[PDB]
Design a protein around this nucleic acid. Structure first.
Ligand SMILES: [K+]
Ligand SMILES: [K+]
Ligand SMILES: [K+]
Ligand SMILES: [K+]
Ligand SMILES: [K+]
Ligand SMILES: [K+]
Ligand SMILES: [K+]
Ligand SMILES: [Mg+2]
Ligand SMILES: [Mg+2]
Ligand SMILES: [Mg+2]
Ligand SMILES: [Mg+2]
Ligand SMILES: [Mg+2]
Ligand SMILES: [Mg+2]
Ligand SMILES: [Mg+2]
Ligand SMILES: [Mg+2]
Ligand SMILES: [Mg+2]
Ligand SMILES: [Mg+2]
Ligand SMILES: [Mg+2]
Ligand SMILES: [Mg+2]
Ligand SMILES: [Mg+2]
Ligand SMILES: [Mg+2]
Ligand SMILES: [Mg+2]
Ligand SMILES: [Mg+2]
Ligand SMILES: [Mg+2]
Ligand SMILES: [Mg+2]
Ligand SMILES: [Mg+2]
Ligand SMILES: [Mg+2]
Ligand SMILES: [Mg+2]
Ligand SMILES: [Mg+2]
Ligand SMILES: [Mg+2]
Ligand SMILES: [Mg+2]
Ligand SMILES: [Mg+2]
Ligand SMILES: [Mg+2]
Ligand SMILES: [Mg+2]
Ligand SMILES: [Mg+2]
Ligand SMILES: [Mg+2]
Ligand SMILES: [Mg+2]
Ligand SMILES: [Mg+2]
Ligand SMILES: [Mg+2]
Ligand SMILES: [Mg+2]
Ligand SMILES: [Mg+2]
Ligand SMILES: [Mg+2]
Ligand SMILES: [Mg+2]
Ligand SMILES: [Mg+2]
Ligand SMILES: [Mg+2]
Ligand SMILES: [Mg+2]
Ligand SMILES: [Mg+2]
Ligand SMILES: [Mg+2]
Ligand SMILES: [Mg+2]
Ligand SMILES: [Mg+2]
Lengths: 34, 158, 52, 130, 44, 71, 110
RNA sequence: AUCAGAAGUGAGAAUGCUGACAUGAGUAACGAAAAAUCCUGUGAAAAACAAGAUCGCCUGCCAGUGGAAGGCUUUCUGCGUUCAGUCAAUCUACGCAGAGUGAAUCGGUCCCUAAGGAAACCCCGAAAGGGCUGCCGUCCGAUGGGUACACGAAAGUGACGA
RNA sequence: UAUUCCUCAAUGACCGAUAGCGUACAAGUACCGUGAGGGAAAGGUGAAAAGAACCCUAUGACGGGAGUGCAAUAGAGAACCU
RNA sequence: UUUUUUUUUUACUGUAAUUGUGAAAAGGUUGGAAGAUCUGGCCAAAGAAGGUGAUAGCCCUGUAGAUUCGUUCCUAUUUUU
RNA sequence: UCCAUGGAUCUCCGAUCGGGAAACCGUAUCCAAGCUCCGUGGCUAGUCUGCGCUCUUUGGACUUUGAAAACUUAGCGAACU
């Protein structure tokens, strides 16, 4: 049976990484109660 | 009016239940115990210190009048009391023989003893219910076993 | 049916119950070959050799 | 197995939210809310198989979600589907169940503002729509 | 008097719709220009 | 639950706010086929079948009890 | 009192009285000990409970009344997620190709 | 401070730009020759609101019934008067909250084509593209023709003006 | 050798809410146009909300006292430093 | 087949340890509150920066570094028709 | 709670299976191979063989390349002044 036989970052990835860092920077400050 | 670009404190050397001394403010020079830590404002509440007077209007549910509760202090306004000499001291990090993190007294003039982690932390804020509810499975039924891959117990309807 | 459903322990225990019920003369080579064909078609080779 | 049918569902997840009827006795139909991608045959078969209803007919209609617009800012709720199910035999709802009595008592607060003949029926079938 | 805007939804979609703009080379440049500007309503 | 949308999402054409021959639909699965006379024929093999086992006498419950028993 | 007389009485909480207490949800380690029949029966029990809770929330909100204990709904919802994850985990571990491809359809089918 | 350095360096006027505030002025006006009057009630306040009585206006293109095009919750019930209404409004197409639209036959979807549009093949053209829809030929397009299987056609037809 | 739809770090005799990007604030938004297209406005209580319990006069406190606070013309509901 | 293990040592924008560790004393006066002023000790391969009730090197988070982890190498990825 | 790594689920348009008023509609692709279950036909009747589909595995048949600012190389190429 032929089953039991043994056998750089893209621009969207850089954009997702930058977006996550942008959220993480906003979440680093003291929240203003309101 | 929170105009300052103040960052959060990520790792707290101040724990709920610790014994501190207020070093700055209206109640400077007075000792107490930490009741609650407000992390999102970098503030703490000392038990019975830094009081304020609130004018609360009472409706059909809550009672009115002028109450008196504690107001938060900044987390850099308190300082942990050395357990030996009783004077406030700084907190450093020491590794034990296992490799367990502890808090040790730091500062010239201090004993360098271990700041004990308070015992109030292990006690639950919301205690467990005494009695089960009418839609709760008793623990003798959950722990029984009906699936076993080696003997093929409980296989589907294939 | 239990061998097609891959309930090997219950099928073995049903074999033993049919033995103790006085019907064991019915297991000729044909029905054991049928059980082996079922188990090999559902890929249970260790239990197939146990049944063997 | 797979020879039984082309569409066989073992784990249904159709959400059904019942609407409280006006009367407590002699209920001939009831209404419910569900997701917009449900079909009359799906609702009838789920209600028959899961709960044990005796369904006669199912009538549906679509609704838009509630919206609020304040000049540029828009907030909204999800769209839903409303279904009317007609029963073969009348059913009833007890008063002692929460929150039936509160619903009736709050409903009656908003709405504050003999000659029987021979062969006259008492409990007649009250079904609306087409 | 009879004003100039007399509405008709099918005419609006047949002149300024997404697949009406996508059909010719000028409308494809219109769609690219709108997306580059950042409009919320790319098509009519 | 109220959630935020864009105000430009009101411009997307819906059959509630369209001329009388506009048809969109709500992604329901089909159950048959259209006829040449404007009708419909429901093919019974495409209807869903539900396999709901008998739940009477079941001992498990929606929640798990949280009484203090042991560490 | 304690048992519904109609299918219509199953959209109501008949045992609600004295604060009523509800437990936590099922964990995956506790679900990994159960058979397929018990897991299917538990799925349908949780489905009926979820229908009751959503009906109760809608009925109470329709008269400007608060929904008591809203945390019951996510417990049921995440328990129902864990059941499907456990069944798919078994369907991966099934060694026969046809049986695994049929168990995945039995789980994910709709 | 002093002594030096770099300049987006000094306002009264460009029928200059933006904002704020005056004058005319408590002046014109309160928008179709149908029209109002009174008892009671609610309210802090009633010519304008609720209910009732008396009078008038519209009846084949301002005024009645159903609904196409467009609008998109303006519909109904409770609460309210900050905004809007040519009001000092208790009322409302106004704000808050909830509810409401049920189809084998109605109107669509579906089938078929017109005017028209587009692909394929072929023809032409610095590029982009333009033509061609048939001799064998495809997909859309109602303002029209159809309402209880599928396949085929050298059969009839559907089929029409003033 | 050319450029920056992009990433990381650093600098400024660069600007400081009619300035600096059109956008310090949920902006290519609201709004205008059939369409291509044009295109805004709007920053700040106080260290901490301790954001004024209670009394009097009005239909109604945003008023006059009382109280919190260093300070109350520092008393606001996309707006209260001078 | 698996597990334990001899396994060299530097470089690194590896802008690695999101946020790991990381030094440094007490008094007096004014002030709503001390970082201010007076007396007086200490750290610096750390006096870049931002907070805390006014202007803080020693109150807080960090910073220089030092330890830990991981890419090359030592330690050749070889053998078979 | 949180973090690192690996997993399970993973709606639709843009868009590419066909149609299209973008976010909708209709869709079991086709043909060889070998395997459990299924039903039916035929023999001299016992480890007898021969016909099918549904769904599963492995191949091969048709096609779906595809975006993007400036830079680069080419084609055509103004007018105000
Ligand atoms: K001027
Ligand atoms: K209409
Ligand atoms: K002041
Ligand atoms: K470091
Ligand atoms: K401090
Ligand atoms: K400092
Ligand atoms: K010239
Ligand atoms: Mg602050
Ligand atoms: Mg309908
Ligand atoms: Mg969204
Ligand atoms: Mg409509
Ligand atoms: Mg769809
Ligand atoms: Mg699913
Ligand atoms: Mg100048
Ligand atoms: Mg000037
Ligand atoms: Mg002038
Ligand atoms: Mg001017
Ligand atoms: Mg006058
Ligand atoms: Mg005059
Ligand atoms: Mg006049
Ligand atoms: Mg009157
Ligand atoms: Mg009236
Ligand atoms: Mg007349
Ligand atoms: Mg006319
Ligand atoms: Mg409205
Ligand atoms: Mg109305
Ligand atoms: Mg008014
Ligand atoms: Mg008034
Ligand atoms: Mg009203
Ligand atoms: Mg209204
Ligand atoms: Mg019809
Ligand atoms: Mg034609
Ligand atoms: Mg053409
Ligand atoms: Mg062409
Ligand atoms: Mg086409
Ligand atoms: Mg056609
Ligand atoms: Mg027509
Ligand atoms: Mg005709
Ligand atoms: Mg500006
Ligand atoms: Mg200014
Ligand atoms: Mg301004
Ligand atoms: Mg527009
Ligand atoms: Mg007040
Ligand atoms: Mg100030
Ligand atoms: Mg670090
Ligand atoms: Mg330090
Ligand atoms: Mg600093
Ligand atoms: Mg100051
Ligand atoms: Mg497509
Ligand atoms: Mg390119």
């Amino acid at each position: 049976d032929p089953r039991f036989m043994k056998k750089r970052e893209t621009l969207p990835e850089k954009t997702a990484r930058k977006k996550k860092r942008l959220k993480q920077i906003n979440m680093s400050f003291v929240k203003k109660p309101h | 009016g929170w105009k300052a670009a103040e960052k959060l404190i990520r790792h707290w050397k101040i724990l709920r239940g610790d014994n501190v001394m207020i070093i700055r403010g209206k109640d400077k020079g007075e000792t107490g115990t930490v009741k609650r830590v407000i992390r999102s404002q970098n503030r703490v509440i000392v038990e019975g210190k830094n009081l304020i007077k609130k004018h609360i209007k009472g409706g059909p549910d809550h009672e009115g009048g002028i109450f008196t509760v504690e107001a938060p202090l900044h987390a850099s306004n308190v300082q942990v009391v050395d357990p030996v000499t009783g004077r406030p001291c700084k907190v450093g990090v020491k590794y034990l023989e296992d490799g367990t993190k502890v808090r040790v007294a730091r500062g010239t003039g201090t004993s360098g003893s271990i700041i004990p982690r308070p015992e109030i932390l292990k006690i639950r804020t919301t205690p467990r219910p005494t009695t089960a509810g009418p839609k709760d499975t008793p623990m003798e039924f959950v722990w029984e076993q009906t699936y076993d891959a080696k003997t093929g117990k409980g296989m589907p309807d294939l | 049916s239990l061998y097609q459903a891959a309930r090997i322990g219950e099928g073995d225990e049903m074999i033993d119950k049919m033995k103790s019920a006085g019907y064991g003369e019915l297991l000729n080579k044909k029905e054991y070959y049928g059980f082996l064909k079922i188990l090999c078609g559902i890929e249970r080779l260790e239990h197939a050799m146990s049944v063997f | 197995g797979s020879r039984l049918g082309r569409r066989v569902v073992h784990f249904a997840n159709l959400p059904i939210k019942l609407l409280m009827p006006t009367k407590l006795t002699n209920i001939h139909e009831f209404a419910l809310r569900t997701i917009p991608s449900a079909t009359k045959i799906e609702i009838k078969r789920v209600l028959e198989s899961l709960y044990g209803f005796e369904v006669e007919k199912v009538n549906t209609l679509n609704m838009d979600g509630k919206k609020k617009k304040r000049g540029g800012l828009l907030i909204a709720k999800a769209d839903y589907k409303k279904a009317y199910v007609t029963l073969k035999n009348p059913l009833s709802i007890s008063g002692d169940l929460f929150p039936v009595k509160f619903i009736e008592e709050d409903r009656k607060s908003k709405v504050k503002g003999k000659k029987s003949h021979w062969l006259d029926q008492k409990e007649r079938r009250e079904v609306g729509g087409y | 008097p009879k004003r100039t805007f007399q509405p008709s939804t099918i005419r609006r979609k047949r002149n300024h719709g997404f697949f009406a703009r996508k059909a010719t080379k000028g409308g494809r440049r219109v769609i690219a220009r709108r997306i580059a500007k950042g409009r919320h309503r790319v098509t009519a | 639950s109220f959630r935020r949308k864009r105000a430009s999402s009101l411009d997307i054409l819906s059959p509630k706010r369209a001329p009388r021959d506009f048809y969109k639909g709500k992604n329901c699965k089909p159950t048959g086929f259209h006829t040449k006379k404007g009708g419909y024929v429901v093919q019974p093999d495409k209807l869903p079948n539900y396999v709901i086992p008998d739940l009477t006498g079941f001992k498990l419950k929606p929640y798990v009890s949280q009484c203090p028993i042991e560490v | 009192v304690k048992i519904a007389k109609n299918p219509l009485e199953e959209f109501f909480e008949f045992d609600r009285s004295k604060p009523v207490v509800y437990g936590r949800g099922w964990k995956a380690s506790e679900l990994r000990l159960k058979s397929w029949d018990d897991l299917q029966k538990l799925w349908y029990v949780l489905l009926k409970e979820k229908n009751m809770l959503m009906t109760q929330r809608q009925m109470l909100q329709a008269q400007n009344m608060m929904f008591p204990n809203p945390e019951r709904i996510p417990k049921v919802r995440r328990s129902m997620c864990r059941i499907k994850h456990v069944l798919t985990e078994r369907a991966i571990e099934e060694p026969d190709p046809r049986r695994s491809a049929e168990m995945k359809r039995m789980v994910n089918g709709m």
